[PDB]
Amino acid sequence: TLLINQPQYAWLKELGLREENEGVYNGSWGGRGEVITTYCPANNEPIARVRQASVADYEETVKKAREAWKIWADIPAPKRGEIVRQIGDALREKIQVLGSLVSLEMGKILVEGVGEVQEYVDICDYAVGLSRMIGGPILPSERSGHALIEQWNPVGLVGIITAFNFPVAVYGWNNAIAMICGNVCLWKGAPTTSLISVAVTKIIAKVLEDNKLPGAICSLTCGGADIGTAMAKDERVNLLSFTGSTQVGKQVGLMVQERFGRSLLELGGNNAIIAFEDADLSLVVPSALFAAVGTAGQRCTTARRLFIHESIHDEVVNRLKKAYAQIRVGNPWDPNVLYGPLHTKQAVSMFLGAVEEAKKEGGTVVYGGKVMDRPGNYVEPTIVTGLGHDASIAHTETFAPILYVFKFKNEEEVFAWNNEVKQGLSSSIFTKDLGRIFRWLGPKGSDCGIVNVNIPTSGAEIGGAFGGEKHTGGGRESGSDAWKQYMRRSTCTINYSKDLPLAQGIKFQ
Amino acid sequence: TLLINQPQYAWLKELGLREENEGVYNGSWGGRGEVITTYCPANNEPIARVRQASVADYEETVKKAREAWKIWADIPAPKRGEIVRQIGDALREKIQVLGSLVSLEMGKILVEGVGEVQEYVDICDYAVGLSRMIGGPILPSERSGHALIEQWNPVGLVGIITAFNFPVAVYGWNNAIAMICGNVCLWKGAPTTSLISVAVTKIIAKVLEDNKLPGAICSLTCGGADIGTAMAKDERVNLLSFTGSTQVGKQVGLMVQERFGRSLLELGGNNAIIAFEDADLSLVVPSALFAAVGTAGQRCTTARRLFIHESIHDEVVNRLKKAYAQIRVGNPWDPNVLYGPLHTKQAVSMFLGAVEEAKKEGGTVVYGGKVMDRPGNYVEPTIVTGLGHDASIAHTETFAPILYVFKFKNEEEVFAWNNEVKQGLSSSIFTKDLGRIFRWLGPKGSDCGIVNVNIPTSGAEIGGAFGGEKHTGGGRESGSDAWKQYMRRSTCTINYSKDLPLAQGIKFQ
Amino acid sequence: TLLINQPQYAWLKELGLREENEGVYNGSWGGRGEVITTYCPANNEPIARVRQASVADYEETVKKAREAWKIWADIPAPKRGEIVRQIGDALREKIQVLGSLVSLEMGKILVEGVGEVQEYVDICDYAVGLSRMIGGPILPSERSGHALIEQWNPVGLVGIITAFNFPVAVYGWNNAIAMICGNVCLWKGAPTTSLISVAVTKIIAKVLEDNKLPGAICSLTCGGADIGTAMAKDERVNLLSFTGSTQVGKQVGLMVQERFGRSLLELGGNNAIIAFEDADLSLVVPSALFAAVGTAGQRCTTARRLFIHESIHDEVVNRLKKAYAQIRVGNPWDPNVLYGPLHTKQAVSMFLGAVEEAKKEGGTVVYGGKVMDRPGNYVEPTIVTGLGHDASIAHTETFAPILYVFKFKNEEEVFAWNNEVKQGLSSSIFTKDLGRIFRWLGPKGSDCGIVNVNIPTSGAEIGGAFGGEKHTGGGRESGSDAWKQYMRRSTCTINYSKDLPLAQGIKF
Amino acid sequence: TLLINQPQYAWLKELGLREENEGVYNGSWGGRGEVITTYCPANNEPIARVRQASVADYEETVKKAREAWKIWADIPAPKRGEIVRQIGDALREKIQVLGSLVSLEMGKILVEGVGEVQEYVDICDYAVGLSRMIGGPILPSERSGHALIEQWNPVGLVGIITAFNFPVAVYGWNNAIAMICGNVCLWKGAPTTSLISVAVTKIIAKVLEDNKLPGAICSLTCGGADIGTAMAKDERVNLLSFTGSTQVGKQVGLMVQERFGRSLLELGGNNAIIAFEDADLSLVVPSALFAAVGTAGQRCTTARRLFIHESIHDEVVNRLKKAYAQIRVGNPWDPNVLYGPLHTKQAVSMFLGAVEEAKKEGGTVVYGGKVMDRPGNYVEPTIVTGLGHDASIAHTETFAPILYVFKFKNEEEVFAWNNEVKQGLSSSIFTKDLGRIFRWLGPKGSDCGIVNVNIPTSGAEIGGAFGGEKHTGGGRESGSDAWKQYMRRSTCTINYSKDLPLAQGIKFQ
Numbered sequence A, B, D: 001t002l003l004i005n006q007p008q009y010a011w012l013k014e015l016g017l018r019e020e021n022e023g024v025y026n027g028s029w030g031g032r033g034e035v036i037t038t039y040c041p042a043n044n045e046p047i048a049r050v051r052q053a054s055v056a057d058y059e060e061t062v063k064k065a066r067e068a069w070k071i072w073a074d075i076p077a078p079k080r081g082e083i084v085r086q087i088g089d090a091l092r093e094k095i096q097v098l099g100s101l102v103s104l105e106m107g108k109i110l111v112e113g114v115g116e117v118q119e120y121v122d123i124c125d126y127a128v129g130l131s132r133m134i135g136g137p138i139l140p141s142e143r144s145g146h147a148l149i150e151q152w153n154p155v156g157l158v159g160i161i162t163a164f165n166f167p168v169a170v171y172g173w174n175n176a177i178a179m180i181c182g183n184v185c186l187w188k189g190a191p192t193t194s195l196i197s198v199a200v201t202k203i204i205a206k207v208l209e210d211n212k213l214p215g216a217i218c219s220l221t222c223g224g225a226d227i228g229t230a231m232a233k234d235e236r237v238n239l240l241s242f243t244g245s246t247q248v249g250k251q252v253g254l255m256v257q258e259r260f261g262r263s264l265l266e267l268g269g270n271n272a273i274i275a276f277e278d279a280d281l282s283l284v285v286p287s288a289l290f291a292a293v294g295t296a297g298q299r300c301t302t303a304r305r306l307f308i309h310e311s312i313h314d315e316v317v318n319r320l321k322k323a324y325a326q327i328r329v330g331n332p333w334d335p336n337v338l339y340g341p342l343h344t345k346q347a348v349s350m351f352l353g354a355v356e357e358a359k360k361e362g363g364t365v366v367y368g369g370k371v372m373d374r375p376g377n378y379v380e381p382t383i384v385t386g387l388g389h390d391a392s393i394a395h396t397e398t399f400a401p402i403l404y405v406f407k408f409k410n411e412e413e414v415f416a417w418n419n420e421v422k423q424g425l426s427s428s429i430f431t432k433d434l435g436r437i438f439r440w441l442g443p444k445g446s447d448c449g450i451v452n453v454n455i456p457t458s459g460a461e462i463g464g465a466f467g468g469e470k471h472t473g474g475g476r477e478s479g480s481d482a483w484k485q486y487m488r489r490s491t492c493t494i495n496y497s498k499d500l501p502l503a504q505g506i507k508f509q
Numbered sequence C: 001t002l003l004i005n006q007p008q009y010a011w012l013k014e015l016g017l018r019e020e021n022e023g024v025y026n027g028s029w030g031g032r033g034e035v036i037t038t039y040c041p042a043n044n045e046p047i048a049r050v051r052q053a054s055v056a057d058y059e060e061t062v063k064k065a066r067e068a069w070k071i072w073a074d075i076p077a078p079k080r081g082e083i084v085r086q087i088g089d090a091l092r093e094k095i096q097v098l099g100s101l102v103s104l105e106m107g108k109i110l111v112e113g114v115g116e117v118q119e120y121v122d123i124c125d126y127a128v129g130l131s132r133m134i135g136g137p138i139l140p141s142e143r144s145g146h147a148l149i150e151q152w153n154p155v156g157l158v159g160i161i162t163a164f165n166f167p168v169a170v171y172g173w174n175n176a177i178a179m180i181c182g183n184v185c186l187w188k189g190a191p192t193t194s195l196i197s198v199a200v201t202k203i204i205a206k207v208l209e210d211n212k213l214p215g216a217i218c219s220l221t222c223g224g225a226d227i228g229t230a231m232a233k234d235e236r237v238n239l240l241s242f243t244g245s246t247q248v249g250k251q252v253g254l255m256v257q258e259r260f261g262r263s264l265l266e267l268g269g270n271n272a273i274i275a276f277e278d279a280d281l282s283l284v285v286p287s288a289l290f291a292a293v294g295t296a297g298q299r300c301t302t303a304r305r306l307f308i309h310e311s312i313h314d315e316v317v318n319r320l321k322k323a324y325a326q327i328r329v330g331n332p333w334d335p336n337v338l339y340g341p342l343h344t345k346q347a348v349s350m351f352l353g354a355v356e357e358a359k360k361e362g363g364t365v366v367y368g369g370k371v372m373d374r375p376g377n378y379v380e381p382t383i384v385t386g387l388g389h390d391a392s393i394a395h396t397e398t399f400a401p402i403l404y405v406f407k408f409k410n411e412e413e414v415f416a417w418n419n420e421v422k423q424g425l426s427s428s429i430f431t432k433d434l435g436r437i438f439r440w441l442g443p444k445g446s447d448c449g450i451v452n453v454n455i456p457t458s459g460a461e462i463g464g465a466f467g468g469e470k471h472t473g474g475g476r477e478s479g480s481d482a483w484k485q486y487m488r489r490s491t492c493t494i495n496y497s498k499d500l501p502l503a504q505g506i507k508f
């Protein structure tokens, strides 16, 4: 029996969810594709069903979205910002129930569920002001009687593919920025968080409908690999923002590049925390814990590698283990719980696989490493010591709560060890040395898109451009001038004079 | 026998050119790959020889360049700008002999040869000031006692692959920007302009060596497709700047995405001039002429499509016909010449082929279309009417002086025809209508990277970012914030406070 | 009796307004100064009274404001933006009663009273995003192992003196930008719009109070010339944003410059519309009309000079006559009314004085020019022809609905005539000539702070920096990088190396 | 007799200086005012004479510069940059003789004389690139069919009044920026450095004339307070850049404000150095020495106040006195000499008076404090301890090598002590504490325009905006966006649509 049919989950109806929901929106609701059932990862019980998009659904949707763009692009950017502001308020009005759904279908703890929705509300308030600012410089032309200007226009249709772990905010940050930039959007979320994608889409839909705007401006085509690949190969998709694993992201990027389209890739992470001898241990230990076990280690910015100086290595590990024992586990919707279940049953298997490989490669499990004997997809937060820093499994992103601890001696080698992996999302060092801090930020420091000091790998905010380097994709979202990725630059020369070109010996007229 | 061994060409020696020249520079001069002889396209005679890089030479060069980066990247950006300043002066001191070499080996007329070198001089002076400006904003953090900064660092090794038509300035614009940004450069130019590449490298090498800097900061590895492919597949090449055809650029782009590297693609063009009924025809006819026949139609920004409104179609054509008949043909280095040869004999084959396919697709040759009985690779400037705007040969970049003329009635359809091709480099309308001019610059206007008004498609300067959209690659060079393509962005959060994270019910210390 | 005591004006109570109101706020409410009574320009009746600030009130308010700054400047800018966001929402909840108060105490039509409040609401939303963006560039130092950064910090206390014609939004645009930039604010509104100042202050106070912040962050000291003069001389006022007449602003600027303080001046205007022969007359006539008679000619951006090409002059004027006679007059809060009363009785007399002085200078009144025989400060919309462009009364800002119409021949001279006056706020041409348009925007073009094409002199918005040149002050508000005027710049070089200076022959 | 008649100073003729020189340059060279004689501060001997500007000279010059502006303003900004580039070149060619003139007439040592000319050279190279960059943003209008652009135009005539201590570079940095911004310049340098002003003018004059440009673009009218006051009152001076004392600057500022003009004020300084307990003393001692005695303590950024923590107070003071004794004083035009003479005889009097006023204030001279028995205006570098930090002479800018030393205990109070004075030009702290450094840069830190860490108060470069706060004037020169002070902003809304305003119940046509 589906949870949404049980009286205790009647609050799901406040998001407009039913026993069977439509997973396509383009002004109209539909879905002739495969009917998927999503499950609560805390108890493996089925919640509700979503009818995904068929190829024909995708086709019709893309066409409706591009026709809607003809209208949306002619709307002044500040007025597009007004729509985004209204989307912000609309999310506020549903922040608790939507945050509850995120906890229910995805499995993160409630304050992170609500918090993720707040991140979307926050990016909306940000995009409202940015909508009056987007543009380029007026340059002084070297030619008398000419103007030189930099114009920015929408790319057209922005395809948005998102991962499971942040089923609201990742789309949200692409949505808010793309909309003020005059783009229409097409969403294909993770299949396992389909209800969430429908819930958000319903909220946005009403805002567009109340303002007499075509709903295809924020289109939805639920589905899996097939819909996603279609988006990657569709020339009508002017920008494809892909958020997910490196393995899938590599193929999406290659498909987009094949058709000379634009891609925005936000891929995997393997982020390290480095603790030098002069570090504040009262700061290092709790920072490492929450960055490693937060969301059960299912953040792209999760701390997965911990380099500690030889002098303080044993102490920091011992203090970590005593703190790992206090981590409260249970239902994600339980306010006393710090630590929820993994998203899927396969995630649990990957967890055990990495643990076994780590041990085989000489590692030692000083805490955890076992599956919790209880309903749901619960595993113990895990700390592994002894592995060589260049161990294969350590160089591999395992989307699970496993922290590999390494020893080091000097600044030069430990910087290289942070950079020696293929991923390049987030990084952090903990130290008080002024010279070291700036070298860390310099050309011989971290090669990551996020480079932090005395704050763990999860430290980011709206004002800055978010993304990573190398195998992380190189794309950027949110702040700074990240909006430029959602627009096309044109360099324009306007001759307003009555001057004629030099004839060069040629008799004209 | 070689031209360089003749008295009238003794000026070649002033560029340090000999009978056979080493085609590899990395601090040392060498080359053990295939020997190539480059020819003057004006008379099809051998000039001199260059010993190209072997694969082993390339490996050695990359190693030395990356080692040279360790030193170059530690040098303050303004001091890197001082180096670029001296490069500019060195080019100034050799501008006539180098300009002549460009005219001799590539085949553009002398004023454009010198002019191209002048462009490298100008971008150097520009980069000097820019070296003191590159960087990111300090942002206000949402967290108390935290600083949020945006850092920019060199990507490292910048591979530059350039085309034949601008064998100096294309590399030059990439070089000046990359160097102030802290990168080392490895250059592979077009094989048929190898002497020009060696000459430029000698000039830069002397500056680097006079400043006691490792010469591998500006490395050279002359070679063909194999050396290029090696660069495209080399992980040690952080950024690959490719300037060339779309066919080759597509494959280069894919190899780079395959290894999650960075590419900058400046590819083919099929640029259109659109003349409206209200256009000043005394401005249109000369603008169209010079944009079409300039550099024997071998500019990437060459005008290849000419849309004329029905009312003025025949008048513009006749005036172009009478104007074309006055174009002065001769050797590039001859005074007061306007039109030289095509670069290769194969390029002449393409010319004839496109002409044949044109009249087979319904086109009429109203001027030119034939080869000139003269030493070298000389063809007649050509005007073709009657072709449908969607004809296959019209949607193709034929790098020869062929101008396709079309009729249009209204503004909506003619904007679409400019945009319907796969290329998206440059575009121009000639009109006096205020509204139309802004619609042209707007979201419903040209889709090109360069959108001009009352100035032909060749209209571009340093101050702005240069590049195109769609199949042109998306890359940008020179002005605005194009320097960000040669650097990696990091978003950095610095905790300078003594605050500790919330305990969340866990007892630490 | 007072208007606030009559049943039909009971809606005033929704704004916290009483018979007699405190005109001082600094976390606490008070007022031991003189009691002022403001009046309704539509019927010359008293609305309610306000206790203005005494000297002691001013002193304790400044001190409390600078104390509150120690807390406010430590609050991260994005969080300050959140406060400004809540102020925006609080304004939305009172947008109709506040807009009605503006129509009542100031005199503009209801849609503009509401419209002015909406402008404050919009600048708040704008400031929210901007609060995450304010800052300077990290620059590449020429010194190895050195960092070069441009920092921006709040100036501290920002004094805000405002005019009567826009008694809500002018303060609003200053308040929103100043707050995200980390400053505290002291507001001295126009005396004749004291109730509006109190009402707006009550709205902001609750938000600050609900968020457990010191109320002095947005302080209010109602008062006249003496309080304003004090702010101009007070070294504890790090920035004085002044919005008012040129005459007053000049003295304000000199006092602030005397003590090496910072000033932001937004002063008078004498804004011109120029209609060339190639202009769309269907655009020119209604644009000229609304720009000239809007808010009874009481905008700083109001069109006062109209230059028309001699070939279209007579046609334009005639069409303006026919349009002017359809202008609907009445109560500003009454529907379909386009035209309310002047702000004060003094303004009416100044209106008549300019009319007579224009006749004596050789001008001709082709429409209006008289006082309307009705309750309130109502005067007819006026069009004056025949004056020479260099006439004294034309060069003078008369804050009243008077439009001076001139003829011109060439583009060169008419550009000079727009620039020849002392004011330099707004300017507009109506033409289709591509070249002329860019010349208008160029070095030989308009010398004004606002330079418009095919849109009248009142064409402005939030995204742009708002201000004028020459006798208009030179200050800027709202958009672009106008926030820099509310902060101080510092250029910082940071040596993080272990390298020592060159000994230069000396042994250490 | 004059020093320009002794063949030992024959090199003065390389700058085109004669016995009596014209001090007025517009299109022509004139001077009907008083004839001033300038003296070498090292031997109190007359060098040469300069015929200064009469009132008629000033009126003619002003009128001629405004006519020249009509031509100069039509010249594209990048082409104006080319002129500035040539100015930089001409200075390079005369850097040795002009630098020697600075040492002769002003009194600073030769490397600082040549170095000051190099500063002008460098800002010229900086300006060239900037001239392609100046402008405002294109913004999205909230109105359909409307463009919103920010424009920047020259202010017109930029009047420049400069001090004695930097008689080349201060004008230089004003000139380079003002010119590329399209303004003409009127220069009135310090009366005591008249020869330098004329020499600099002659260099620029040759450049302008060789380019067939009206020489009035860089006009010169030598004079004292009378010419300066006329500029401050002149409505035809759209911008007055004043560089000098706070006393004079105040009155200048008031006059310009009286007539609603623009002023850029760069005034007095009273710069402090704060050394905390955790400071590297190997860095502090030489840093404080060179900052205090540099240019005989006649820099506007000279360190005049020195706050040392009580724990390290006695040591640092001793080390300074030990190093102070090693300072090699002599002729400025002589090698290995670190300290030269004061500029005038009146400067020596002010020096002694300040020494006396500090003794009566309870301070103790621990080194120097007396005049040097030798020709010229030579004084001993002085160190004063025991003074109260709020002593009247301590808050006073005495333009002589006098360093007041104060003790402190905690961070909050010593920050206040740096800000407690009227001056706010430059400030420096020396420490390693991460949190302290950021607080120093924060809202509760220094109130100065230059806020340095681990570098003396003389630390400034081209890239950043140079200027101070409070009684220092508020003006900014050189880097960042300081160029906006030389131009006027306009916010331009362009209606390019065919739309008509709402009739509001009125019948039109």
Ligand SMILES: *C(=O)c1ccc(N(CC)CC)cc1
Residues within 6 Å of the ligand: C119, C165, C166, C169, C170, C171, C173, C174, C298, C299, C300, C301, C466, C477
């Ligand atoms: C002139 O009357 C005037 C100037 C500025 C404003 N603002 C901007 C601060 C409020 C909309 C209103 C009126």
